[PDB]
Design a protein around this motif. Structure first.
Motif, short mmCIF file in Angstrom:
data_model
loop_
_atom_site.label_atom_id
_atom_site.label_comp_id
_atom_site.label_asym_id
_atom_site.label_seq_id
_atom_site.Cartn_x
_atom_site.Cartn_y
_atom_site.Cartn_z
N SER A 395 -4.72 4.52 56.49
CA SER A 395 -3.38 5.02 56.30
C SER A 395 -3.37 6.48 55.91
O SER A 395 -4.37 7.03 55.53
N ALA A 462 -0.83 -3.02 61.74
CA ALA A 462 -0.86 -2.31 63.03
C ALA A 462 0.56 -1.94 63.46
O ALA A 462 0.74 -0.80 63.93
N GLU A 464 2.85 -1.14 61.59
CA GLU A 464 3.24 0.00 60.72
C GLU A 464 2.44 1.27 61.05
O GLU A 464 2.77 2.31 60.48
N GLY A 465 1.50 1.23 61.99
CA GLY A 465 0.68 2.40 62.35
C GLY A 465 -0.63 2.47 61.58
O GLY A 465 -1.24 3.56 61.55
N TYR A 466 -1.08 1.36 60.99
CA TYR A 466 -2.30 1.31 60.15
C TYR A 466 -3.34 0.46 60.85
O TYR A 466 -3.18 -0.77 60.85
N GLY A 467 -4.36 1.09 61.43
CA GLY A 467 -5.40 0.44 62.25
C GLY A 467 -6.57 -0.05 61.43
O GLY A 467 -6.92 0.61 60.46
#
Ligand SMILES: Cc1cc2nc3c(=O)[nH]c(=O)nc-3n(C[C@H](O)[C@H](O)[C@H](O)COP(=O)(O)OP(=O)(O)OC[C@H]3O[C@@H](n4cnc5c(N)ncnc54)[C@H](O)[C@@H]3O)c2cc1C
Ligand SMILES: Cc1cc2nc3c(=O)[nH]c(=O)nc-3n(C[C@H](O)[C@H](O)[C@H](O)COP(=O)(O)OP(=O)(O)OC[C@H]3O[C@@H](n4cnc5c(N)ncnc54)[C@H](O)[C@@H]3O)c2cc1C
Ligand SMILES: COc1cc(CCCO)cc(OC)c1O
Ligand SMILES: COc1cc(CCCO)cc(OC)c1O
Lengths: 524, 523
Positions: A395, A462, A464-467
């Motif tokens: 993040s 994912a 939320e844009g958190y890989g």
């Protein structure tokens, strides 16, 4: 009798004879008792999901090459361990159930070279953090390792899964310098300056001439690594480790927004700063039953009793300072002034705190100074038959992001009856939310909940844009599945390379969700 | 000029199809327009590396379509960002006849700067100047890391693993995420950018599985359309200093003092450089000013250079960063250590400002991410001056520096070329960066320079010193030195190239890596 998928009993019999012909009968293991020792200790589905049909221990690079050529002749899938302590991620168990495990660490366990002045080691895969530590203490004491929490793992193996520790050399892959790797048809190559015969520079610049390949052999099934260089930090003249307790779970937002500006220039937060929740902290020094023996999540008053009884906060910050005591005092002054802005913040040095509550502080002091430890394994006494699976998405290092994740993960964990034991770590400009999902490995329902929870945590993170950065065998297809920009462009790139280097589909099929043609779209 | 392998029919059919994609103005086939993409410092033959055309795609979608057209008609495509690869072939293709894809002409936007998290997302045509100018106006807490010249591509320089001299000197290291068009036209994002809706593309270099970005550097595996780079925070204060060393032979002690002060990134906080007299005389003067005679520069002139300009044989430049008290403490340690060398003289950027201070003042700029073109003065050393890079990697050990100094300048003398050279310590590696200056307009000078460089590479290699970056003309030879295990590293690169580039389209022969249709045909 476990057979690899796609291999006849006859071809398996022929391969085992051929493998014995190379390594020695002693170093081809097929007995159930020897195989059980390569079970994932922390299975998240069944336990029968990832099994070894055999374990092969090659003596040297030449034997690695010959076992790979034998595997190609007979279509034998081979998985790869260094020390196989990848606990949280599958241990030594193959992604492809029935694979033959190549145990590189058992016989290839030598420290090949240590240069004290230029600060590097050339290592074999069986060198543990303990081994290298022992060697440096005896022969190159100006140098120190960078170890993860446990240190029974492989300096090579950890770097190849892109693991991390907490000194300034925490990013293990970054400090990896040069490789020797056996390619999937049995060719050997040296990366970087090692590809120049007689070069003296293999371990002092990572790149060499032309395309830089080493990364492609990390979290990868493109090769078996037989030698790996790593740069080694000089011990500073002095060091000091501190704990900052924070009372409120809502403090996380301000703690992260103060941490980033203090870490992004690598000073004053000189090492990898960690913010651990009360549970991860309480679980090293206590058991769950000590605080609560009822069903459902731990109630707030159980949490409150941990804070009070152990002298801890909900969030516990741990950092080390390095250099001459004048610099340490000054940097510690900047740290105290900055985090002191947060009401309820309390500061304790490694020489000021020596009680139950300071066990983690004292253990962090070892780890942050490259002294390997097994203390964090007491965390696996939290509950009976405890096992863990890792969840560690990336993040931005911003409080709002932290708060979002804290809330999302805890809420889901509560729903799935799993304790929220986590930490937020900032590397330089990135944040990791590392949650240790603990569960009864001996309880099929708990295993199933942990898998269900982790799959949900990965999808929601994912969205939320958190890989996810690193994951278990059971989760690799789903995690690679999240990295599907360009209608799965990354995986198609990986498959194209895999199928070219590995036309017979031999090396660790399914690693990172990368399957060779003969195994892909077969559901294993 | 036609591309090798291609018939004229196919070439014109592709040129037409190129025109439909990028438009008539951005497909250039005039020998006037092609002339500007000539290697300005050709080595050996000046006609060795020519372009058949230059195509300037508007965007990723256009790069993809021009790559698909290339694949249809078998047109080799070479690639530039700003094509200022001077010393290495400029914007000239390795494969003579190739069509140059000019990514920088139209794809030149700063896509994003985040001041707080310290990064930019860049297209290829962003120059160091562009990015500096942007930051000063909108993200002033941040600074670029630039090489000696500012007119180059932040992207293109990173993709050849070029370097500057701030703590962010390793441009590839700080490169964070990239979007690439693969050889058959597919596009992909690396690292965290492979996750749709990702918020962390420029925050961590590695994503989930095998880490690929490296394979797109010194490489013909694809055309980069976007690149992230980490950007360092401006420290509160800075000061650049110069140590002059009287003796040739001081090199050994200088390097042995340098390593222990650099390996911990303090007190030598930036990339330390050690320039010889010729390298910083050649800025601020012409060879004519010191010697008009024949053969090598005799010792008397190096000395008159030294005395007239107040330089040493070896000139150390460093920068210190932080609060003034930290600067002074760090400067005290550096003085105490290098001051052990007799003839050592120390001056800051505040206390010189004379003709001989030109390089110190230029280093003060470059070391603080102010870009410059002042080092181009160097190319006035002799009429029609060009240079070729020679830059092998060695251990940062005095013994190794002295061996390299001797063996390079002995051969330079023999081949009638000045010894103008830098020793640089990165962290635990040393670079011997020699600038071989020659008359680009003289066929003998050009021939001799190629001969000299070939010999330098072989002798360096025999000593265990590999070349890190090299000219088009030298790529096959340099890859040939990296031949551990019967050419194992090149065989690996060929297998990947053939897998990703089955039609052998992207920059054939870059770093000596030839696709199947072109391999072993001598170019
Ligand atoms: C409580 C707890 C705390 C932990 N803390 C940390 C931590 O701080 N940091 C951290 O990084 N991890 C941590 N882990 C995970 C784990 O303990 C370490 O990462 C450990 O070092 C990895 O196992 P290993 O070193 O034996 O590697 P291995 O199991 O030998 O190898 C790891 C992987 O690398 C590949 N591989 C290995 N050898 C080769 C080879 N020769 N060629 C090619 N590929 C190869 C395979 O993909 C293999 O599965 C923790 C785990 C637990 C349960
Ligand atoms: C006097 C002098 C001093 C110099 N000092 C330095 C120095 O300090 N540091 C340094 O690093 N260099 C230095 N150089 C070399 C050169 O000037 C710089 O490296 C320059 O920045 C490179 O040119 P460029 O940025 O325009 O890159 P480009 O020429 O645009 O690209 C460089 C190479 O990268 C590849 N490439 C470019 N764009 C793409 C793309 N979109 N996709 C795929 N591949 C691509 C190609 O292989 C290309 O040839 C110096 C040169 C001279 C003459
Ligand atoms: C830095 O990477 C990891 C850290 C931990 C520590 C967990 C809390 O102490 C566990 C991991 O995997 C299970 C990691 O990968
Ligand atoms: C750091 O890398 C380079 C530095 C220079 C400057 C030379 C002396 O100022 C030239 C280069 O290419 C010709 C380089 O690659």
């Amino acid at each position: 009798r476990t057979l690899p998928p796609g291999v006849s009993d006859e071809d398996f019999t022929s391969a085992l004879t051929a493998f014995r012909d190379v390594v020695g009968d002693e170093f081809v293991r097929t007995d159930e008792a020897e195989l059980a020792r390569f079970h994932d200790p922390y299975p998240v589905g069944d336990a029968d999901a990832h099994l070894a049909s055999a374990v092969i221990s090659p003596r040297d690079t030449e034997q690695v090459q010959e076992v790979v050529r034998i595997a190609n002749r007979y279509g034998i899938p081979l998985s790869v361990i260094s020390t196989g302590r990848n606990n949280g991620y599958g241990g030594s168990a193959p992604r492809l159930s029935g694979a033959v495990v190549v145990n590189t660490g058992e016989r290839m366990n030598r420290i090949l070279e240590v240069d004290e002045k230029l600060g590097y080691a050339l290592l074999e895969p069986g060198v543990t953090y303990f081994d290298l530590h022992e060697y440096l203490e005896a022969h190159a004491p100006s140098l120190m390792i960078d170890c993860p929490d446990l240190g029974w793992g492989s300096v090579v193996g950890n770097a190849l899964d892109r693991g991390a520790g907490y000194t300034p050399y925490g990013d293990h892959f970054m400090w990896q310098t040069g490789m020797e790797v056996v390619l999937p048809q049995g060719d050997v190559m040296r990366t970087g300056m090692g590809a120049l015969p007689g070069s003296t520079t293999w371990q002092l610049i990572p790149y060499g001439f032309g395309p830089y390949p080493d990364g492609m052999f990390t979290q990868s099934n493109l090769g078996i690594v037989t030698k790996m260089g790593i740069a080694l930090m000089q011990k500073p003249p002095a060091s000091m480790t501190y704990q900052i307790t924070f009372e409120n779970e809502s403090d996380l937002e301000q703690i992260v927004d103060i941490m980033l500006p203090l870490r992004i220039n690598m000073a004053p937060l000189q090492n990898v700063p960690v913010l651990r929740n009360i549970i991860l902290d309480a679980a090293v020094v206590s058991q769950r039953a000590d605080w609560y023996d009822g069903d459902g999540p731990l109630p707030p008053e159980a949490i409150e009793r941990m804070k009070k009884e152990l002298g801890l906060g909900y969030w516990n910050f741990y950092g080390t300072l390095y250099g001459p005591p004048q610099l340490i005092e000054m940097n510690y002054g900047i740290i105290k002034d900055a985090f002191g802005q947060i009401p309820g913040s309390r500061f304790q040095t490694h020489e000021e705190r020596h009680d139950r509550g300071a066990h983690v502080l004292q253990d962090r002091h070892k780890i942050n100074n490259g002294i390997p430890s097994l203390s964090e394994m007491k965390l696996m006494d939290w509950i009976p038959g405890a096992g863990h699976v890792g969840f560690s998405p990336i993040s931005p290092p911003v409080g709002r992001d932290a708060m979002k994740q804290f809330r999302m993960v805890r809420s889901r964990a509560d729903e799935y009856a799993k304790d929220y034991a986590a930490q937020f770590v900032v590397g330089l400009r990135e944040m990791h939310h590392i949650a240790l999902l603990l569960f009864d490995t001996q309880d099929a329902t708990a295993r199933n909940e942990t898998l269900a929870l982790t799959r949900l945590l990965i999808d929601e993170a994912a969205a939320e844009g958190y890989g996810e950065y690193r994951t278990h065998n059971a989760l690799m297809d789903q995690v690679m599945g999240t990295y599907n920009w360009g209608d799965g462009a990354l995986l198609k790139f990986h498959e194209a390379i895999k199928d070219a280097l590995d036309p017979n589909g031999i090396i660790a099929p399914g690693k990172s969700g990368v399957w060779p043609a003969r195994y892909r779209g077969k559901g294993l």
